[PDB]
């Protein structure tokens, strides 16, 4: 045939892949963690958004740390041969590098290690997307007026917030980041490469949201998400 390019992931496998959504709203009383009001809005928005991208969505609610590890290990041991990609969305409390099950924390590294190029062979060379709506610390942004491949290759971490910072969630509308992510996927998934979509998400979160609080410490604060890309190709959710 004629000249061929290979700058973009092959996304025309028989299936787009799994979208695992872990929605932790209620936490064991003994942890002292508050309920995450609004997160069901996020989980429903994500389910619909990724359904329209033709992902096989599985929603899981209120998982213990043990259930999270078991679920991710089980999913990584499925045969993904017919699947173009893998997506996991984590909605929970967190700290830098950590997501909370309902009864205690899980290292993000423990979850993502199941999908390493050498540990999940049917996803080797395919994009593995981890979308994380969780705090990465307690900083607040006060804003300003205006033959082998690496085992860590082909991961994308779409973090809701910058390293070290809180992440904002509205109890009525859902989290700033997930709200903006779904809106930008809905509007641009048939048009833009995924890094460009996530950049529009960054701009939407950065410009359209600002906290309102009766507590001066938490009032008038801002947020910027953080795209951490280890991908090796462009990612379009459509194919020719």
């Amino acid at each position: 045939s004629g000249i061929s390019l290979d700058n973009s992931y092959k996304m025309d496998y028989p299936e787009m892949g799994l979208c695992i959504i872990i929605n932790n709203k209620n936490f064991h009383k003994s942890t002292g963690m508050t309920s995450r009001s609004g997160t069901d809005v996020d989980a429903a928005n994500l389910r619909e958004t990724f359904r329209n991208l033709k992902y096989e969505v599985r929603n899981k609610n209120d998982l213990t740390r043990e259930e999270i590890v078991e679920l991710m290990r089980d999913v990584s041991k499925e045969d993904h041969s017919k699947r173009s990609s893998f997506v996991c969305v984590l909605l929970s409390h967190g700290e830098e590098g950590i997501i909370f099950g309902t009864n205690g924390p899980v290292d993000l590294k423990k979850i993502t290690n199941f999908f390493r190029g050498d540990r999940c062979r049917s996803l080797t060379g395919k994009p593995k997307l981890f979308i994380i709506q969780a705090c990465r610390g307690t900083e607040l942004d006060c804003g300003i007026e205006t033959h082998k491949i690496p085992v860590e290759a082909d991961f994308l971490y779409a973090y809701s917030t910058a390293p070290g910072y809180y992440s904002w969630r509205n109890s009525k509308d859902g989290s700033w980041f997930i709200q903006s992510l779904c809106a930008m996927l809905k509007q641009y998934a048939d048009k833009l490469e995924f890094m460009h979509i996530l950049t529009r998400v960054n701009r939407k979160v950065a410009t359209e949201f600002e906290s309102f609080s009766f507590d001066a410490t938490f009032h008038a604060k801002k947020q910027i998400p953080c795209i951490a890309s280890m991908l090796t190709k462009e990612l379009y959710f459509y194919h020719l």
Binding site: T34, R36, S37, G38, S92, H93, G94, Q133, A134, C135, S160, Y166, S167, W168, R169, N170, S171, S175, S211, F212, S213, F218
Partner: peptide
């Protein structure tokens, strides 16, 4: 608005 709340933090996570």
């Amino acid at each position: 608005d709340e933090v996570d």
